[PDB]
Design an enzyme around this catalytic site. Structure first.
Site, mmCIF file in Angstrom:
data_model
loop_
_atom_site.group_PDB
_atom_site.id
_atom_site.type_symbol
_atom_site.label_atom_id
_atom_site.label_comp_id
_atom_site.label_asym_id
_atom_site.label_seq_id
_atom_site.Cartn_x
_atom_site.Cartn_y
_atom_site.Cartn_z
ATOM 1 C CB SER A 241 -0.951 -0.027 1.192
ATOM 2 O OG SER A 241 -1.743 -1.215 1.154
HETATM 3 C C1 1RG Z 1 -1.487 -2.377 1.754
HETATM 4 O O1 1RG Z 1 -0.373 -2.717 2.056
HETATM 5 C C2 1RG Z 1 -2.659 -3.272 2.031
HETATM 6 C C3 1RG Z 1 -3.668 -2.626 2.994
HETATM 7 N N1 1RG Z 1 -2.998 -1.485 3.611
HETATM 8 C C4 1RG Z 1 -2.635 -1.684 4.863
HETATM 9 C C5 1RG Z 1 -1.783 -0.739 5.648
HETATM 10 O O2 1RG Z 1 -0.930 -1.231 6.387
HETATM 11 O O3 1RG Z 1 -1.987 0.464 5.472
HETATM 12 C C6 1RG Z 1 -3.240 -2.804 5.308
HETATM 13 S S1 1RG Z 1 -3.169 -3.387 6.948
HETATM 14 C C7 1RG Z 1 -4.888 -3.176 7.486
HETATM 15 C C8 1RG Z 1 -5.185 -1.689 7.427
HETATM 16 N N2 1RG Z 1 -4.611 -1.233 8.695
HETATM 17 C C9 1RG Z 1 -5.257 -2.170 9.617
HETATM 18 C C10 1RG Z 1 -4.699 -2.154 11.029
HETATM 19 O O4 1RG Z 1 -3.611 -1.665 11.289
HETATM 20 N N3 1RG Z 1 -5.466 -2.842 11.902
HETATM 21 C C11 1RG Z 1 -5.093 -3.401 13.143
HETATM 22 C C12 1RG Z 1 -4.333 -2.721 14.094
HETATM 23 C C13 1RG Z 1 -4.011 -3.342 15.284
HETATM 24 C C14 1RG Z 1 -4.430 -4.638 15.538
HETATM 25 C C15 1RG Z 1 -5.167 -5.333 14.584
HETATM 26 C C16 1RG Z 1 -5.613 -6.731 14.836
HETATM 27 O O5 1RG Z 1 -6.172 -6.921 16.006
HETATM 28 O O6 1RG Z 1 -5.477 -7.618 13.999
HETATM 29 C C17 1RG Z 1 -5.500 -4.710 13.390
HETATM 30 C C18 1RG Z 1 -5.093 -3.543 8.949
HETATM 31 C C19 1RG Z 1 -4.094 -3.432 4.239
HETATM 32 C C20 1RG Z 1 -3.967 -4.939 4.135
HETATM 33 C C21 1RG Z 1 -3.280 -3.627 0.676
HETATM 34 C C22 1RG Z 1 -2.344 -4.408 -0.217
HETATM 35 O O7 1RG Z 1 -4.471 -4.372 0.899
#
Ligand code: 1RG
Ligand code: 1RG
Lengths: 505, 505
Positions: free
Chosen positions: A229
């Protein structure tokens, strides 16, 4: 004898590599050496010689004595433990006055900082017959014909050792915590493109040779990644210039069906009808796919090419990888919008990101400051800031920068773990899947991610860009998913800004 | 992910290097992998798994259990011992039906003959992240961009595996017997310049990587030697063509006084007034010095240049050394007449020596027969016989050959240890002093010699030239002085002539 091999320097004149003299232990053990001589010229008491020599070399007295007993031989050496001895080791052995013992001078290549920017500086190897040294990786190889000699030329890098230390320490911490399969961090001057620090893990120690050859590839120039991303910033910049991105216009989040496959936002359901600005803060995959539809697939491919992707940056490293823009079918096109299928090098990412902070002008990254000869004063090469191209306008650059600010600092942010107390930070996160090296598809597992952050501080008018990326943590993969590379980015960026005298908020 | 890297072949189509599939052991150890499954999908019994796995990999059961106990980890591997496993290793582990255990396929670079022409073929290294292979020495490096892919191109050498075996076995014998610091042997077709076999000691094993990097320099192309008395043949050829050498005219042996240094024949006293032919059989230093005086120092320097010395032969190896003609003052000139001061590469010696067997035409040595792609059938390159120059006439060549014959076969010869039973042998011996790599003299000691033989058989019309050289034997150094490289030349030459169906008498 060989000419002195030239030195490698950092940007402040600190030696990173040089030629030094060390010593090799030699024992004459044949009685015929003392046949026509007043005082013995060979080892008389093998046992006493073994004991006393054992106090200066890392060999047990039993082994010294066993080696000293070899037959049909005039003199013997003591293998790896007998060579590379210091000038103080030499003086200590000579005080012992052992008959038949002497020390031979040898030239070695010395790396004062040991494991230190190792994959960038490289290592020179010695042909024991002639003493001739030849670079086998990195700067030592690329510039081997200048560094090699009555005296070779010196190579000055843009590396700042003080900043390099911050990067080495942060990467050691990442290995301990996450034991990832791959890891890199790079620090670039945001206004010149100079590489101020660079390291990767796993790596080798140029001084000892430890682990040299286990991974030939320099991460910055030669390895390729599906960036994830972090790649959305260039999709965003394109969308802004085409008039397709409006931060407040709503769009349908959730999923899209592409050639029969369902690609959805990271939460499977989305957030309904939300503003486009919030889409980017949330790292919505369906935003980027929607934006591609509005710009047009043909126009989007050219946009990624205008940002320097798919071709080498033409830096000074050997075998620089070009990457490739994955555009064969609509599924490759759409997944490229959020950084899969398309592969990049970290140096391409630094080159592209720099446009947002130089009125749209991409800066060509560079790490070689000078090649010059200290005797004649001839300067063969001098590095420079260079515009690699200007894909976007000043206005687009600023509008990109406004969404990067929101990624880290929005109330709705999911990247607050990259915040540094006292410093204003911005950038883009990435959590990308990693292609299976053989089996096809993507690597499976609980959190099989390449996590990364393309960050800069102070926001809007940054001093440096810090790009760190970690591939497939084998330890704490839950926490690597949640925190990304924040545990590396924060000490690197914080320590760098302080060393560069930027004032805390 | 990666295209198949092309193969390296010998001249009869035997594989010297290719891509194979091998296997990596992977253990899932987290109970969460078996949450919704009837039969276990993770390692349930660590102790039984370790014991049973300890029987297929080289790891003690305590360590397998220790690795299987790692925490905050979903899967674990077993380091170097867990990878590069064979297809039978796979079948054996899978028969055990151990829960959570599996094998991943990995591409490795396979060298079917192990330690075999290693410094010529080189070695490719693997980037673990991508599987991408990259040549790091020899053919694998020189032709990396062809071998790399699609499917990469093949590289066929002129090496003959059957003859290479003779050379590897003969050099193994020299090391055991003499433990020298350096050692090489090369077999060249006397009529084409094709390199039929080549090896050196010490060397590395391309298959395992053992000892790789300890010596970068390929002896044939990259290392330089003070040749010693083998160099006298070119002094002889010049003198024959200039009318200064008459085989029956006598000359004063003994010594000559050169810039205040007394240079004498190897027996200190000489043999009185002897004919020039006998001078050469004896390897007289004063003969070569006398002939140089008759020809003129200026004319002699040009002669050695027309024999290709002082410059690269422009072969296909990387970083080919040029050597240098030692001509600064008269003491350098005069010692150059018998192969000291001047430095050469073994390939320059093969090139110059070939003039005597091709009517005066030097043959450019060569080892690459073809670079071609087996899918498209495109041939990128095809090697061929090539004349490097014709420095002498047919008549001069014949008169050189007559003296080389006598060197081995005169009643007064001191090279009778190079005679082979049933085959007529000729050539030139050398017993040269070796420059100390650090400090400014010669290596001191009882017999501190680089001993060599430039031989060809059958005499007059040889099939192959065999050049062997041994630098600074540390075991049996008296015998190395007396016998030279005869214990290597004889089995190499005899076995090769038999393999080529030359008739024994
Ligand atoms: C890009 O790499 C990808 C999508 N972007 C991102 C990113 O890192 O910006 C993700 S990760 C997804 C979005 N951010 C969320 C997050 O940080 N959630 C989170 C935080 C703390 C704990 C948990 C948990 O309990 O699991 C989750 C998750 C996203 C995959 C593209 C390629 O799709
Ligand atoms: C050339 O390299 C060198 C002179 N040429 C050679 C040569 O190898 O042809 C030598 S070696 C010298 C001549 N052959 C003698 C020999 O083999 N003597 C010998 C044989 C057996 C036993 C003993 C003994 O009992 O010690 C001796 C020695 C010569 C140095 C130029 C550079 O001088």
């Amino acid at each position: 004898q060989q000419p002195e091999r030239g030195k490698i320097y950092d940007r402040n004149g600190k030696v990173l590599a040089e030629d030094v003299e060390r010593y090799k232990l030699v024992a004459v053990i044949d009685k015929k050496a003392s046949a026509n001589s007043k005082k013995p010229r060979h080892v008389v008491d093998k046992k006493e010689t073994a004991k006393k020599l054992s106090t200066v070399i890392d060999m047990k007295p039993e082994e010294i004595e066993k080696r000293l007993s070899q037959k049909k031989a005039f003199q013997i050496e003591f293998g790896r433990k007998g060579t590379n001895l210091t000038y103080q080791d030499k003086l200590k052995i000579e005080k012992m006055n052992l008959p038949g013992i002497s020390l031979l001078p040898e030239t070695e290549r010395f790396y004062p900082n040991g494991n230190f920017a190792s994959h960038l500086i490289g290592r020179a190897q010695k042909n024991p017959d002639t003493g001739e040294l030849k670079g086998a990786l990195g700067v030592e190889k690329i510039f081997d014909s200048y560094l090699s000699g009555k005296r070779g030329d010196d190579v000055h890098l843009t590396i700042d050792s003080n900043i390099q230390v911050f990067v080495e320490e942060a990467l050691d911490g990442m290995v301990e915590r996450y034991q990832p399969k791959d890891l890199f961090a790079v620090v670039m001057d945001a206004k010149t493109g100079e590489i101020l620090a660079y390291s990767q893990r796993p790596t080798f120690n140029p001084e000892t040779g430890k682990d040299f050859g286990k991974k030939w590839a320099n991460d910055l120039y030669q390895n390729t990644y599906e960036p994830g991303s972090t790649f959305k910033s260039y999709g965003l910049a394109a969308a802004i210039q085409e008039g397709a991105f409006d931060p407040d216009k709503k769009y349908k989040s959730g999923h899209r069906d592409i050639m029969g496959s369902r690609i959805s936002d990271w939460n499977r359901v989305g957030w309904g009808e939300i503003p486009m600005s919030l889409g980017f803060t949330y790292s919505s995959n369906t935003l980027m796919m929607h934006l591609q539809d509005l710009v047009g697939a043909d126009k989007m491919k050219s946009w990624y090419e205008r940002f320097g992707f798919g071709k080498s940056t033409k830096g000074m490293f050997d075998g620089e990888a070009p990457g490739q823009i994955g555009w064969s079918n609509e599924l490759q096109q759409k997944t490229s919008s959020f950084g899969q299928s398309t592969t990049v090098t970290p140096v391409q990412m630094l080159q592209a990101q720099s446009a947002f902070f130089n009125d749209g002008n991409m800066l060509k990254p560079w790490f070689v400051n000078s090649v010059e000869n200290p005797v004649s004063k001839r300067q063969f090469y001098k590095g420079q800031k260079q515009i690699a191209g200007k894909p976007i306008t000043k206005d687009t650059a600023e509008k990109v920068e406004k969404q990067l600010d929101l990624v880290v600092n929005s109330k709705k942010s999911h990247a607050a773990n990259y915040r540094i107390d006292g410093y204003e930070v911005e950038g883009k996160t990435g959590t990308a899947q990693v292609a299976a090296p053989n089996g096809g598809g993507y690597v499976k597992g609980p959190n099989p991610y390449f996590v990364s952050f393309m960050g800069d501080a102070p926001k809007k008018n940054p001093k440096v860009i810090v790009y760190a990326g970690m591939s497939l943590a084998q330890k704490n993969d839950q926490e690597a998913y949640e925190l990304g590379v924040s545990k590396a980015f924060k000490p690197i960026m914080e320590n760098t800004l302080k060393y560069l005298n930027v004032g805390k908020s």
